[PDB]
């Protein structure tokens, strides 16, 4: 259960798991997550910007 | 005599039998009422 450095995972197929839903940004107490999204070339809902300020995050 | 079936007239009915009779009844119909417009979208 230890919480350390953040990471973004992928599916076993290699596709990234994030679907650009911004619940990250909604629930982050410190507002350390900045997300910007647009439809991908194949039409998927994927992020174009995903930034985490580790000096602002409270882990 | 109550041992025979008298509803045998339906054994010779074409595909237009129902509509052919409707054409015959068009002469006996009373004039239809009018709502004052040709259609609800008029």
């Amino acid at each position: 259960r230890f919480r350390g450095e953040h990471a973004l995972r992928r599916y076993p197929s290699g596709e990234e798991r994030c679907i650009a839903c911004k619940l990250c940004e909604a629930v982050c107490p410190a507002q350390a997550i900045t997300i910007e999204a647009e439809p991908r070339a194949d039409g998927s809902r994927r992020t174009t910007r995903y930034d985490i300020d580790m000096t602002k995050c409270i882990y | 005599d109550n041992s025979t079936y008298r509803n045998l007239q339906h054994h010779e009915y074409s595909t237009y039998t129902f509509l052919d009779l409707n054409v015959e009844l068009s002469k006996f119909r009373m004039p239809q009422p009018s709502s004052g417009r040709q259609s609800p979208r008029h």
């Binding site: 930034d51 | 709502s35 609800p40 979208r41 008029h42």
Partner: protein
């Protein structure tokens, strides 16, 4: 990131009445413009109007 230099950018105050809001603005000295409330006016609605003998309100579908 989206930078700013206006301290009052996120400042939103809630007041119960226009009179209270105007009094607060006047006593704090900022300039202000007041917009009147736009309530939705009452409307006449009848479900039987969808099936009308001679009016155009008759619907073509449900």
């Amino acid at each position: 990131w989206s930078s700013t230099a206006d301290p009052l950018s996120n400042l939103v105050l809630t007041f119960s009445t226009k009179e209270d809001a105007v009094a607060f603005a006047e006593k704090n000295g900022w300039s202000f413009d007041v917009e009147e409330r736009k309530v939705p006016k009452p409307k006449s609605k009848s479900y039987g109007a969808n099936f009308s003998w001679n009016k155009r309100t008759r619907v073509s579908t449900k």
